[PDB]
Amino acid sequence: MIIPIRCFTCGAVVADKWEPFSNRVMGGEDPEKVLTELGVNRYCCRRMLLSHVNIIREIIHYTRPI
Amino acid sequence: LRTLAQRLKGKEGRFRGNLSGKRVDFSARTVISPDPNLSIDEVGIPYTIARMLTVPERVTNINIERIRQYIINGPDKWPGANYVIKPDGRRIDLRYVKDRKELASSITAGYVVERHLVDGDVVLFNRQPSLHRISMMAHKVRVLPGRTFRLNLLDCPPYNADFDGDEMNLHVPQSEEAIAEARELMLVHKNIITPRYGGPIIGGGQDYISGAYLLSVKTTLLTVEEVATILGVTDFVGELGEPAILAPKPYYTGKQVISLFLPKDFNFHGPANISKGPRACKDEICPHDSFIVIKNGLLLEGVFDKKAIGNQQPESMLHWSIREYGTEYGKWLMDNVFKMFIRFLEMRGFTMTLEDITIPDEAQNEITTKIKEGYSQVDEYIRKFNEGQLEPIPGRTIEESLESYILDTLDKLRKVAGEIATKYLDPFNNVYIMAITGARGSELNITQMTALLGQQSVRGERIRRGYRERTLSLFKYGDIAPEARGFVKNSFMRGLSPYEMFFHAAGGREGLVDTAVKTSQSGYMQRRLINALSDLRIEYDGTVRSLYGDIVQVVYGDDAVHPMYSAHSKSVNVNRVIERVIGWKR
Amino acid sequence: KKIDISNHELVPKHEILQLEEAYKLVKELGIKPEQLPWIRASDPVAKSIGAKPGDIIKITRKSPFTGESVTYRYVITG
Amino acid sequence: GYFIVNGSEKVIIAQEDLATNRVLVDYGKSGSNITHVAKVTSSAAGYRV
Amino acid sequence: MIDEKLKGYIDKRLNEIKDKIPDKLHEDLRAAIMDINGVELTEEDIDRIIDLTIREYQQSLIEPGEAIGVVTAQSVGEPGTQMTLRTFHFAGIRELNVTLGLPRLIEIVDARKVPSTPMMTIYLTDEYKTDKDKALDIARRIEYTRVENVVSSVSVDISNMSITLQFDQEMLKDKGVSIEEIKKIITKLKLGEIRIEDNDEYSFTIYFEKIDSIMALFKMREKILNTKIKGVKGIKRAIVQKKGDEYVIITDGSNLEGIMNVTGVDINKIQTNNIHEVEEVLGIEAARELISREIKKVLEEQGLDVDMRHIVLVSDIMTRTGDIRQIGRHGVTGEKSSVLARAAFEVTVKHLLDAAARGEREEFKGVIENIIIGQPIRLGTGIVELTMKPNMR
Amino acid sequence: LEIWPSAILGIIASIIPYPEHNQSPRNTYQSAMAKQSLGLYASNYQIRTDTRAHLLHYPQMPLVQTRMLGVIGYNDRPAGANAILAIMSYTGYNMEDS
Amino acid sequence: MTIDKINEIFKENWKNKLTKYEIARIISARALQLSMGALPLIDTSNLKSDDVISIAEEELKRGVLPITIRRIYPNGQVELISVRKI
Amino acid sequence: RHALATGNWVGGRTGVSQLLDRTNWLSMLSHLRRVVSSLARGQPNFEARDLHGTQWGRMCPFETPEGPNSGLVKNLALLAQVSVGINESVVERVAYEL
Amino acid sequence: SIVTRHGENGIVDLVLITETLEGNKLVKVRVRDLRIPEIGDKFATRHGQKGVVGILIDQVDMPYTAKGIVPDIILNPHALPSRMTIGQIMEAIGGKYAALSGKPVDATPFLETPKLQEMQKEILKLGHLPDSTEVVYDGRTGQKLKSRILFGIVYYQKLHHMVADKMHARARGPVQILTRQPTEGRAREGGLRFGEMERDCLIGFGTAMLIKDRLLDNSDKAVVYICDQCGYVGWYDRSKNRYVCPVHGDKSVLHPVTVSYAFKLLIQELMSMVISPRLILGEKVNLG
Amino acid sequence: MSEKIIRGVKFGVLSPNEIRQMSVTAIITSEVYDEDGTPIEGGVMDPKLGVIEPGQKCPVCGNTLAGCPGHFGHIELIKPVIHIGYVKHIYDFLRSTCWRCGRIKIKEQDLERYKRIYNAIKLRWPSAARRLVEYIKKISIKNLECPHCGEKQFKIKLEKPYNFNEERNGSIVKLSPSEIRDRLERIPDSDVELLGYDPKSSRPEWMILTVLPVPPITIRPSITIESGIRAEDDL
Amino acid sequence: VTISDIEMLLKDTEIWDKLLRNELSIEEAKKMFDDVARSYSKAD
Amino acid sequence: MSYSLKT
Ligand SMILES: [Mg+2]
Ligand SMILES: [Zn+2]
Ligand SMILES: [Zn+2]
Ligand SMILES: [Zn+2]
Ligand SMILES: [Zn+2]
Ligand SMILES: [Zn+2]
């Protein structure tokens, strides 16, 4: 739904690196260079960042009326 | 409406719903999960079930302090108790007791306490459909954190259970006589040998065989620390002895570590499961470890594989060891030596890489040439068939000999391709090790992965159902070439073409269907046979008689020998006795 | 059909038991004579040896466990 | 592609069956006085014969 | 190999235990000791071997009170769930489809009068044993060829009131039958006042001048087309095969007496797939042995291991009453002697109504009824009677 | 001429990666089990009332994709996660399908 | 050899042995007896377990139980076998 | 309405209307493309469950249930299209004038 | 009143109140609960590799590699050679390449891009071994394993067969009104069926008292009084004191017998028809 | 008095007099309850038959559900009716005996020899006895005259399910249960046991219903499920 | 035919029962056995 | 508990 705070395999914080990576890739930059220069080197954290879906931007429209 | 006749009918009426079978209490059903740290006659149960199912123990003058301690702990503390039954017959619920600390001191001999399940309690553990008698066995309770029933990996074959999501049932006997009978007749370790034939049903599985082979091989050398780590999982403590190799560096060996557990008068000479290929040396002078030689409890050469410790392998060294040192030594051995196999397997590395299936490009060229030769032969057969020129096999007509010729040459092509693929592969890789040791896989699976799959067939014949005179619309009218009828010349590693995928699915669809029919027919036949042979008994004079008096056999079998106590359907193996006596000097 | 079938390889050896032997067998087994397995008097092998109702037929069969095994049958009318 | 009936979502599963207004021929059962059989299943506007 | 003094010691020590082991075991033990070569052996080893053999045999005996019937039923019915349809034809024929596995086991157990796909294995006499041409001739002599499968086309002419028959030469050539023989066979049918006139090399015509009816002419045509020309009834096709150094015939039909009547057939070695046929022809003991062999062959082919004692026991119980009986509705209810167990086997009230009408009585001798009402069974621990002396502490 | 040779498969068999390197029964088993996985089933799941519902907290789209995963919209309603898989024998707790 | 040699061997073997069913029945009866009254015939202080089943097994093993088994043959012959060593 | 909420259709058909399987996206997508054989479970016949060569491009060769319904419940292929039909009169007239 | 189902709890998630087109008040309450993976949960892949969790291992005890990466799931090699799923290993390699490179991977059948050789070369170029194997150390002892272990990024799915919804145990509770036998259903406090085949196993083991305990003492046990002459069931009233017979009145002696209550029901419903079953009694104690 | 065990079960056909004497009440009225008054006298829910709700005492016996076995009622049928489960048996009782004198239509001396053989072999060889009785029935059915009374007997054909239509030189006559019972009442005991039946426990005219037994409520309890009106069962 | 067989079976059972009670010795039992056999073999 | 007493 939203980016996990930490990588699942190793406890590395990865949530703070989502909004840069999600932007510069949309700007035409290849993901590998951005990931390397952001400080992500183990492929577990690369898996965490590369396969996020971010559904919450659609669920904010359909929220419990409580 | 449902009337008196309908009130007693079907599988939900009175006879099959409330008389032959019925719902009972003091039972549970739960998913099962593996646990290699339990004994072969133990079952792990969760805390919730242990605190719900209770066993009534009568208070005597011998076990009164323990029962008092049980009463002191409430229903919510384990171990504890749920109810206390006064000698008058009235029940007291410990949930509403104002102060059970004084009630514990108030009890005397004659009271009954319904305590929680504790370690060592005997329960009945079952897995449906319960085909045979050892599908329901007596196990000893061990309480562990979790939510599933825990079963040892060696206990699976009798239950025919694997951890794909299966559930099993547990029953708690509630009387002293029932508990005594279950403990004295239904214990797991007492039923290692199956009654169908003379051979162990509980034995080594798949990781155990690979670990045993890797530990027993000639080239294994262990240091003192490695030996201590391997032996830390067992109960063995004592003198290791001198290392097998003293200089330059002190090294033990796998056979020396294994030999610490064999009895000091055990002799065995026999081949191994790896002695089928080019390793067959047929005698003790073998450059390979393809012949097992044990003298006075010392393993001098040979490896352990499916033919030495595997389950359902009669006349193996495990079978003779059990037969000569009781289910007691059988259980001790299975509990102790079978864990070093796993420990050494995880001490070494056992994986499966894609490089164990790929063959060099020089092999693929030979496979292609063989395939082209076979296709040319089939084409020659077909071409000469269209103009007579065929001498049919005697007793067979034309158009029946052509199909036989085609099938024969395709099978020969498959065998040749498999041999070529096997020859050019690495003789020592994990897939080949699993295949030869009997852990998992077979030669056919290796052939299909590395070389061509072969000819797919439906009901024993080539795939023919489809359009008129052709299976698919991708082929010409009236084509009986090998490709057009379901011959797959590719491998799983190489990948299949679309029509080859279709032919493979068409060939394999029958397995998804036959299972339900087979199980239903088996159930019906077994029910009839049980109802026919239910009331037969063996008298004190050896005869087999029905409970109504009449005689079926003058003496059971022909020599009054139980199949369970026989040496693989044999009263006694005289060669085995001669070996047991004088095998240390052969 | 005059073909003799007593020499077929599926046919064990049948013999007619004497009255003394039958009496000893019945007393030692503690049974009534009709509690043994039955054989019809019209059976081809029983007819080949002239078996009559009320007799006891001793049958010797091949066996992989003891070589030869001996069983008994009671001749009933039919 | 579904319906909302009483709040629930219901779907009509496609049903595959033999063609109706056609003639199907076959051999008769072995050991019977009938050698060959033909069958037609005419479909009307409400009933099938 | 063995010293003569040692051999005398062997005989002396073996003659003292003749009454403690079966005779076959005594022969096997004696032969095994005589085959010990390359190793010197003393008298202590011999004593140990003999004592161990006797003790092992004694420890391998069965225990009175065993519920052997349920064990045998479970040992036979458990492999039935692991059967597979791995094969669809004979060993090396690729035709003559066979039924093995679970359906064949059910057919044997249900005691069907006629098996699905009956077969026969015919051995040849010593004179005809090693001749392929003779084996082929004998196989061809009994294939049961019919008129319908040697003609190309048949025509009916109501204008001439006649039927024209045209023969395919190739099939007529391989069947080994001439036109004159077929003409004689047709004349032997006694169809009425008829006449046959030749038309071609392999074609003739019958005129049926007696009959004047549009009906029954097609009936006569069909009767002619169904006429046998050679072979024995029941056999569909026979195939000559080589087993060892001899030639055998595998047959897709079953007719035991007809084959016994055929010249050149070894009557004392013929084996058939049909159990009722051999039961009626050879006897009940032959049927018992055939049932045992059939069950063993069915189980062995699938690769499943079952002890022979279970098979012998089920074969014995199946042929107890002097003839083969179905083990279920006719082998349970036949010797049930119980109403509740029979009424619980199949869920019906017909048996209860019959028992009430005939005023039958139940004795609760078996195990199912005792479990139903709630009494202990008389197997296992129910066979044991205990007596105690409480006064002696 | 065939428009798409891979279009002989269904809508669930089109999610298997490299389906031509597996045995035939495995793909049928995969279809049966993929009809049961947990994940997001609708965007407005919080306002609709279903008798039984499941929600995966952090679903991820597959790293190894197929051409039909994006067409059917599976990348927007994923039902799983990517796991670092090791292939080895360890402690005997993964024997026999576990 | 009354009827067969194998039957004589069988009866001779089982003349002085206890089948597992007899052992189970004896243990069950003794365990039921100890559960109510019936003070043990052994020293119940060195025993590892204080439950009735273990005491019954130990008493049977030591051979102190005054229990006899009657085996009634199909022809009416009866045989008395005693478990006390004495 | 009573026909849709129960599935008991006219002509003796049963189970035609079923509740939508909204476990996930793939469950709903597969449910909306299922095809059930009418003449089924009355006998195996060992031939209605075969993979006929005519199914190429029309039914998925993998997505089938396991058990009694194996080979009788199928799923549409990717590009398959069920025809809707026209009136026979115009075809008859054009055939006659041809 | 509507109550929460037995054996399951949660947190009230939503409450809705509306009208069903006729003025009737309709109330809906949705309750949620949290499910954390545990031993017994079922997982699967896209290649037919279902299985349950055998144990959960911490990060310290996992076999870390030379870069500190620990596996998320460990899969036994022995499951591969028999099932013959090469696509599993191919997907593992492809996923590792996709995570390393950041490039898209397409695995459509017959048209896979990139090929395996290109992916392996690129993996080697990015600092990892081409065969997707790694050097692994033991997390418990620190000893380097003698072999290399294959690592991948296979995609996994969680199925709705959770162990938290499959446990059910019964000690005692409600019984049927007719047969007086334990009820059926997890929500009805439970009850397990003891079929015929389990009874056959018990008979095969030859345990009479265990059979009696399983089938009689723990279900529908009852005591009934039988007349000594007609054989029908009498009773024992609380007027003052009497063993009374339905036909003999007070002129017969009645004996009590313990029996399954289902058998008594069978007798009663047999007398509903014209069948007359008379029970013949016998001595409990065997004289001699 | 001593505690006993069940040793055997003796079956049979329940006598109408025995049904009358085992019953406690006679069911006369036709309404199950009035203004929810299930204890209405003479109904199927009469409290004298049994009690099923927790708090109540049975009128017949001062016992609650714990110790109250069900009590049977009786209904006096005004027109005899035939048991559907027994029809085949009475079929064999119609084609194997004379309609007028009610005796087997086999002559005297061979019938006496047959019954002597049957009694001498009844218990030792039950299968042989069954064969003997089936042979006797077959040879008695195929006789069209009664030697005992010298009368010519017609034939009866069975029509499903329960109606027997006898042929009487044309104009097939439908048979009534009353005359069937009258015919079956005349068969002597010595001849009914020869056919494989028991006269003292299964008498053929008891096989024709004149009084019907009423099962207690404990066999047909009223279910109050769905939190609404109680739902009665089919019985 | 069938009735003669049943009488044969009954008489054989009676002779065996009498012999088992020691009412008559072996030789007269054998004479009765084969006398019954010959007497009832005429019908067969 | 039974007696089976007789005189
Ligand atoms: Mg499983
Ligand atoms: Zn990470
Ligand atoms: Zn070698
Ligand atoms: Zn009475
Ligand atoms: Zn009452
Ligand atoms: Zn008359």
Numbering used by the authors:
A (entry chain N): 1 to 66
B (entry chain A): 295 to 880
C (entry chain H): 7 to 84
D (entry chain B): 148 to 196
E (entry chain C): 1 to 393
F (entry chain B): 638 to 735
G (entry chain K): 1 to 86
H (entry chain B): 393 to 490
Give sentences from the paper.
RNA polymerases (RNAPs) are the engines of transcription and an important target for the regulation of gene expression relevant for health and disease. We have applied single particle cryo-electron microscopy (cryo-EM) to characterise the structural bases of RNAP inhibition in archaea. Here, we present the high-resolution structures of the inhibitors RIP and TFS4 in complex with the 13-subunit RNAP from Sulfolobus acidocaldarius. Our results reveal intricate interaction networks between inhibitors and RNAP that rationalise their modes of action.
The high resolution enabled us to identify five prolines in the cis configuration and an additional zinc finger domain not previously reported. Compared to previously published archaeal RNAPs, our cryo-EM map revealed a sequence register issue in the Rpo8 model starting from loop β5–6. Interestingly, the chain retracing led to the repositioning of the conserved GGLLM motif21 at the interface with Rpo1′, as seen in all RPB8 subunits of eukaryotic RNAPI, II, and III.
